[PDB]
Amino acid sequence: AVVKCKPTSPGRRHVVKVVNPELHKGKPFAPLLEKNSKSGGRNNNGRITTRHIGGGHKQAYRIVDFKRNKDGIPAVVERLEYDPNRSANIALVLYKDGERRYILAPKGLKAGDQIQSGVDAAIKPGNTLPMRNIPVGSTVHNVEMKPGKGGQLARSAGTYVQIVARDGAYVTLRLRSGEMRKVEADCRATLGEVGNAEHMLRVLGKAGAARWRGVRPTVRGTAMNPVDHPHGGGEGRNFGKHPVTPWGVQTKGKKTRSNKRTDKFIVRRRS
Amino acid sequence: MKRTFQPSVLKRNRSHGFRARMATKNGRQVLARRRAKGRARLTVSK
RNA sequence: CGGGUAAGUUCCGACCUGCACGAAUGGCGUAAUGAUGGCCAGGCUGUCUCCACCCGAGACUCAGUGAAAUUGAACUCGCUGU
RNA sequence: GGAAGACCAAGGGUUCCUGUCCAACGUUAAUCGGGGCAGGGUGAGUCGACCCCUAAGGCGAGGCCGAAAGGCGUAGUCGAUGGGAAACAGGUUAAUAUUCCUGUACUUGGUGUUACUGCGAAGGGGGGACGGAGAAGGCUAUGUUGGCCGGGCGACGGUUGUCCCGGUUUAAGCGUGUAGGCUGGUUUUCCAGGCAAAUCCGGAAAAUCAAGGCUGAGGCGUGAUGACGAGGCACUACGGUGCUGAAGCAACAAAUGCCCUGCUUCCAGGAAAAGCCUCUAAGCAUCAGGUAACAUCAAAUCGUACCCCAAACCGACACAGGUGGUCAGGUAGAGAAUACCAAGGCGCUUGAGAGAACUCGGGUGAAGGAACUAGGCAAAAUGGUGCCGUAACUUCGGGAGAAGGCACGCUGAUAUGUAGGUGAGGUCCCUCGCGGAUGGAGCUGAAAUCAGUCGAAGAUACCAGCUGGCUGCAACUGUUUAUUAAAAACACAGCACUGUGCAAACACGAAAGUGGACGUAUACGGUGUGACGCCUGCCCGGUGCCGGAAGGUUAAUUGAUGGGGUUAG
RNA sequence: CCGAACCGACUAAUGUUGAAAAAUUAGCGGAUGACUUGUGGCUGGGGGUGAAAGGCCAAUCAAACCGGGAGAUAGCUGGUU
RNA sequence: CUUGAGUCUCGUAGAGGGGGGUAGAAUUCCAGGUGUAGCGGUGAAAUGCGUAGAGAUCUGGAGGAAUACCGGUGGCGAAGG
Ligand SMILES: [K+]
Ligand SMILES: [K+]
Ligand SMILES: [K+]
Ligand SMILES: [K+]
Ligand SMILES: [K+]
Ligand SMILES: [K+]
Ligand SMILES: [K+]
Ligand SMILES: [K+]
Ligand SMILES: [K+]
Ligand SMILES: [K+]
Ligand SMILES: [K+]
Ligand SMILES: [K+]
Ligand SMILES: [K+]
Ligand SMILES: [K+]
Ligand SMILES: [K+]
Ligand SMILES: [K+]
Ligand SMILES: [K+]
Ligand SMILES: [K+]
Ligand SMILES: [K+]
Ligand SMILES: [K+]
Ligand SMILES: [K+]
Ligand SMILES: [K+]
Ligand SMILES: [K+]
Ligand SMILES: [K+]
Ligand SMILES: [K+]
Ligand SMILES: [K+]
Ligand SMILES: [K+]
Ligand SMILES: [K+]
Ligand SMILES: [K+]
Ligand SMILES: [Mg+2]
Ligand SMILES: [Mg+2]
Ligand SMILES: [Mg+2]
Ligand SMILES: [Mg+2]
Ligand SMILES: [Mg+2]
Ligand SMILES: [Mg+2]
Ligand SMILES: [Mg+2]
Ligand SMILES: [Mg+2]
Ligand SMILES: [Mg+2]
Ligand SMILES: [Mg+2]
Ligand SMILES: [Mg+2]
Ligand SMILES: [Mg+2]
Ligand SMILES: [Mg+2]
Ligand SMILES: [Mg+2]
Ligand SMILES: [Mg+2]
Ligand SMILES: [Mg+2]
Ligand SMILES: [Mg+2]
Ligand SMILES: [Mg+2]
Ligand SMILES: [Mg+2]
Ligand SMILES: [Mg+2]
Ligand SMILES: [Mg+2]
Ligand SMILES: [Mg+2]
Ligand SMILES: [Mg+2]
Ligand SMILES: [Mg+2]
Ligand SMILES: [Mg+2]
Ligand SMILES: [Mg+2]
Ligand SMILES: [Mg+2]
Ligand SMILES: [Mg+2]
Ligand SMILES: [Mg+2]
Ligand SMILES: [Mg+2]
Ligand SMILES: [Mg+2]
Ligand SMILES: [Mg+2]
Ligand SMILES: [Mg+2]
Ligand SMILES: [Mg+2]
Ligand SMILES: [Mg+2]
Ligand SMILES: [Mg+2]
Ligand SMILES: [Mg+2]
Ligand SMILES: [Mg+2]
Ligand SMILES: [Mg+2]
Ligand SMILES: [Mg+2]
Ligand SMILES: [Mg+2]
Ligand SMILES: [Mg+2]
Ligand SMILES: [Mg+2]
Ligand SMILES: [Mg+2]
Ligand SMILES: [Mg+2]
Ligand SMILES: [Mg+2]
Ligand SMILES: [Mg+2]
Ligand SMILES: [Mg+2]
Ligand SMILES: [Mg+2]
Ligand SMILES: [Mg+2]
Ligand SMILES: [Mg+2]
Ligand SMILES: [Mg+2]
Ligand SMILES: [Mg+2]
Ligand SMILES: [Mg+2]
Ligand SMILES: [Mg+2]
Ligand SMILES: [Mg+2]
Ligand SMILES: [Mg+2]
Ligand SMILES: [Mg+2]
Ligand SMILES: [Mg+2]
Ligand SMILES: [Mg+2]
Ligand SMILES: [Mg+2]
Ligand SMILES: [Mg+2]
Ligand SMILES: [Mg+2]
Ligand SMILES: [Mg+2]
Ligand SMILES: [Mg+2]
Ligand SMILES: [Mg+2]
Ligand SMILES: [Mg+2]
Ligand SMILES: [Mg+2]
Ligand SMILES: [Mg+2]
Ligand SMILES: [Mg+2]
Ligand SMILES: [Mg+2]
């Protein structure tokens, strides 16, 4: 549910929380945990290569099954859990043979539900099939781009993909961006939408709430000196130039896609 | 007031010690230079 | 122009003749917050009228130790002129 | 005296102790010294390092990449600031001591017996193993008072008592298993999981019992017929040694320490690997190996002095500076504030006089009270607890400690000490205990009311908000020009535009790669704006961006055609 | 929210051949957080890092330090027995 | 007391309400085929669209909204509907 905080202090007045009473309150499933230490946005030259990253809360990595290739064996949802690594929630599922795995939690999935993968799985939310076996027009998520590679599209909270057509070895998908994209029909997809759609309704409310998430402050280029940024300089607030990135490329409409290798799969760009 | 030299022997040896000098060709040229000058103490290594 | 003062180039409220405001290089408001800018009042006082006395640490004298910047050379006054 | 005491890490390196010397060093003198010279001093199976194990990160056989130098990285191998066995009390030196001595312990390993016996890993599983905040209960450290024991009878009125002073200490280990915390137990059968196997873990189905296990502070017992112990006595080379030794209990208060890696709750969702336990594979078969008891041997090496909020470290100085961790007594107090003290440590390495101006740091001030000044700068002032009471405005939380006001010491009574807390003997019960119930002796003890009483003054010292009215700017908490700027600047939650379909855009990089992200459009980057409320109008001619692609123009490339040089003729 | 430790640095006086090449004293702000701190690691000079002041990168910063090209060049100033 | 008011039994008509699904027509857009100089609009025009191939015509796709005929001074609802 979406809950406004009461304004008992200035840093709380605008906070809006997403509170889900169904998420597990205890610890995660340890055999599927890994450590995952932070980067500060720095690569192996030790240089900052993505600005505005650092700090935030310590986080363990949950191994999530994006391939969904344990075919023919049913699993039951044991519990939903918070995952710090992503916007979606995850579900711990127990297979009939006694194996446990984490999956992205689809909308509507709850403890006790049954799921299955494979060519013969039923058309139900949480089931995974090759898109060859999914009716045209369906809503799916966690879509593979190459067969067997694992889900890569529509994984964020509340996202989904529409199967709009099927021609030969390929299906045409409408992505969340609005792009129409061809993908091999042997690629798998999970029925339904990714859950936790209220994610986008939260309001951080204060500066520190962004710092808790590992985001460091953004300094506007127009607030700098010319040596630092093309926008810098001026006696007072001055601008007088076409907006650019810190490295000089136009940043208000100039397109940057240049991938002739994958152009053949884009039926229609998002705009 | 806190001054610039705050000694630590581990940091001294890791930063400037004999084995650190031997690890790169530029560090071995430091040692070659100091041997040619005839320094009595080649490095910080105690 | 009005208010506040005995008296107000500041302040507050207006007027519009905007040298040269104006709508996300945002416009107009806004409770709360501020070692933030301006203005007024009560209390308070050596801030002041106008300073007095006192207690300590130096300054001063004696003994011991013992610097510094500077320095062409000096037998190194005023005035009016040059 | 929450240090200017005690003790570590770091850093230093003989500064430590003793004798001797006073040139230089010491801001003076120096017989003294962290100074000179000489001698002495650091004792470990248990403390630390080394060691086993890993984090960030480093290096890295082959490998991939790069003119060369080199870059990245796999298998690996390093790397603590983290995980991993075990010792305490007393005594002793001029100087070391959990290291020496006395007493009493514990751990790991090698051997060898004996008894019994499926052992076996580079593999599987378990465990190790983990956040923030908050709330209590049970405790101990520790303190206070009484009792006890020893001593005292007071330089000046009184002091044989409801008087004064001191002491009243004891460990690890071993045994016991309590307040509390967690979890149902046991036995069969079966199985697409745990790269193979598995009796282990996971899963399924039955039967049966309902209490079984795990964890755990403290207490109690033992350790201890010991040790220590106020003092006494005897010697001193008057520094100190030698000898002996009483009581050695209870109640109450009580941590920020322990139970507690608990419990409750929240979202921002909280290392790793080994030691350890367990399972089997290859293999081994009356062998090896395993388990237990007993014996015996081993536990090396390096550090250990001394300073450590400092005269020994970082600051050129015996420099108002800087420096992480641990300990935490009394009275008042909410307190680790503050005042006065304890243990303990110090008076800061020039002194002696004098009592001018002027400077510095403070005290008080007649009448006036901001007239001072750029400006109330500075100063003065306010200041506690309980109760009464409190406006506009407001995002309904605030504003608010608004403002303003009253009470406050001591003595007696209520009540020879109350409400409350604590809780003995006794008594009863028991599935007999570290038990339940009853009962309340003793101990501790607010707050209030009534009456009285002293002073100019009872929050008496230290300590400890000045308040209100109008307005600009920024929503707010934050950040910044180390060393003249803390702000209205930066950031910020929120908003919008825009890029990005994943081998993402983008960034570091001749490259390999790496970050973005073990993320996937409810995501990620860039840009502007800057909570919230009401809103955000017109202009696409210019510059940019986006789309279009018929025509004009146009590169390398191609080399038609024309012209020339040469000369067989 | 009030307030010590701890982290800061708004005002004033002193100091300015300082006790100190940035402090002392009286007041001042934060004080469960975008907090603070120990140990170790990583980023390198047209480069880093920057809640952005051209701030900081060893008392050095509109391009660190050290060595080299190097006796750069100096239509300028000084000096020239 | 049973005549007002209500309960039960059986049936009837209804665009009464809430939720979900689906169908066909049409508009627009996208792609392609044929085809060529106009289309569109008005009182008349112009802006606009079109030789970069529109309009027209055929095929395929995407998507949203509304439900022709039935349909009625017909029905249902407290009103809004
Ligand atoms: K999450
Ligand atoms: K910003
Ligand atoms: K600018
Ligand atoms: K810079
Ligand atoms: K500017
Ligand atoms: K400027
Ligand atoms: K270093
Ligand atoms: K702008
Ligand atoms: K606004
Ligand atoms: K301020
Ligand atoms: K103001
Ligand atoms: K001196
Ligand atoms: K007496
Ligand atoms: K020692
Ligand atoms: K005191
Ligand atoms: K005198
Ligand atoms: K009582
Ligand atoms: K106060
Ligand atoms: K505003
Ligand atoms: K400030
Ligand atoms: K700033
Ligand atoms: K508002
Ligand atoms: K608001
Ligand atoms: K324009
Ligand atoms: K334009
Ligand atoms: K930390
Ligand atoms: K330097
Ligand atoms: K440079
Ligand atoms: K009906
Ligand atoms: Mg960013
Ligand atoms: Mg994340
Ligand atoms: Mg932003
Ligand atoms: Mg600037
Ligand atoms: Mg530029
Ligand atoms: Mg301007
Ligand atoms: Mg302009
Ligand atoms: Mg006027
Ligand atoms: Mg006036
Ligand atoms: Mg005005
Ligand atoms: Mg403007
Ligand atoms: Mg303008
Ligand atoms: Mg506009
Ligand atoms: Mg504009
Ligand atoms: Mg604008
Ligand atoms: Mg603004
Ligand atoms: Mg010496
Ligand atoms: Mg000595
Ligand atoms: Mg001596
Ligand atoms: Mg002397
Ligand atoms: Mg002499
Ligand atoms: Mg000496
Ligand atoms: Mg000596
Ligand atoms: Mg390498
Ligand atoms: Mg090699
Ligand atoms: Mg490694
Ligand atoms: Mg190792
Ligand atoms: Mg360590
Ligand atoms: Mg000693
Ligand atoms: Mg005790
Ligand atoms: Mg007497
Ligand atoms: Mg005992
Ligand atoms: Mg014991
Ligand atoms: Mg505490
Ligand atoms: Mg010692
Ligand atoms: Mg001294
Ligand atoms: Mg000092
Ligand atoms: Mg400190
Ligand atoms: Mg105390
Ligand atoms: Mg104190
Ligand atoms: Mg005098
Ligand atoms: Mg005087
Ligand atoms: Mg004075
Ligand atoms: Mg005074
Ligand atoms: Mg006066
Ligand atoms: Mg008087
Ligand atoms: Mg007076
Ligand atoms: Mg007055
Ligand atoms: Mg005046
Ligand atoms: Mg005047
Ligand atoms: Mg003042
Ligand atoms: Mg004062
Ligand atoms: Mg108060
Ligand atoms: Mg008690
Ligand atoms: Mg103004
Ligand atoms: Mg602000
Ligand atoms: Mg602030
Ligand atoms: Mg400054
Ligand atoms: Mg300042
Ligand atoms: Mg990649
Ligand atoms: Mg702005
Ligand atoms: Mg600062
Ligand atoms: Mg201060
Ligand atoms: Mg505050
Ligand atoms: Mg505070
Ligand atoms: Mg260089
Ligand atoms: Mg500037
Ligand atoms: Mg510097
Ligand atoms: Mg340059
Ligand atoms: Mg040259
Ligand atoms: Mg020269």
- From the CA of A141 to the C1' of E65: give the distance in Å: 58
Which nucleotide has the least CA–C1' distance to A237?
C25
What is the Cα–Cα distance from A171 to A136, expressed in whole angstroms?
9
What is the Cα–Cα distance from A54 to A44, expressed in whole angstroms?
16
Which tokens hold the place of A124?
A: 């139900």
Which nucleotides of strand E lie under 7 Å from a protein CB?
20, 22-23, 33-35, 39-44, 48-54, 58-59, 62-63
CB A39 within 8 A of CB A214: no
The strand pair at A33-34 and A90-95 is best described as unpaired
The domain B1-46 having CATH identifier 1.10.287.3980: the answer here is yes
Ligand 24 centre from A122 Cα, in Å? 58
Instruction: Say what the resolution is, in angstroms.
Output: 3.2
Work out if A110's Cβ lies within 7 angstroms of strand D: no
Q: In chain A, after which residues does the backbone break, taking C–N over 2.5 angstroms as a break?
A: none
Q: How many CB atoms lie within 10 A of CB A141?
A: 28
Experimental approach was cryo-EM
CB A137 within 8 A of CB A77: no
- From the CA of B2 to the C1' of E22: give the distance in Å: 12
Question: What's the distance, Cα to Cα, between the start and end of chain A in Å?
Answer: 34
Nearest CA to A91 among A33, A24, A21, A1?
A24
Nearest CA to A140 among A156, A159, A122?
A159
Work out if A144's Cβ lies within 7 angstroms of strand D: no
Q: Which domains does chain A have, with CATH numbers?
A: 1-113 (2.40.50.140), 117-194 (no CATH), 195-271 (4.10.950.10)
B11-17 long-range CB contacts below 8 Å, 24 or more apart? Answer: B12/B44, B13/B44, B13/B45, B16/B43, B16/B44, B17/B43, B17/B44, B17/B45
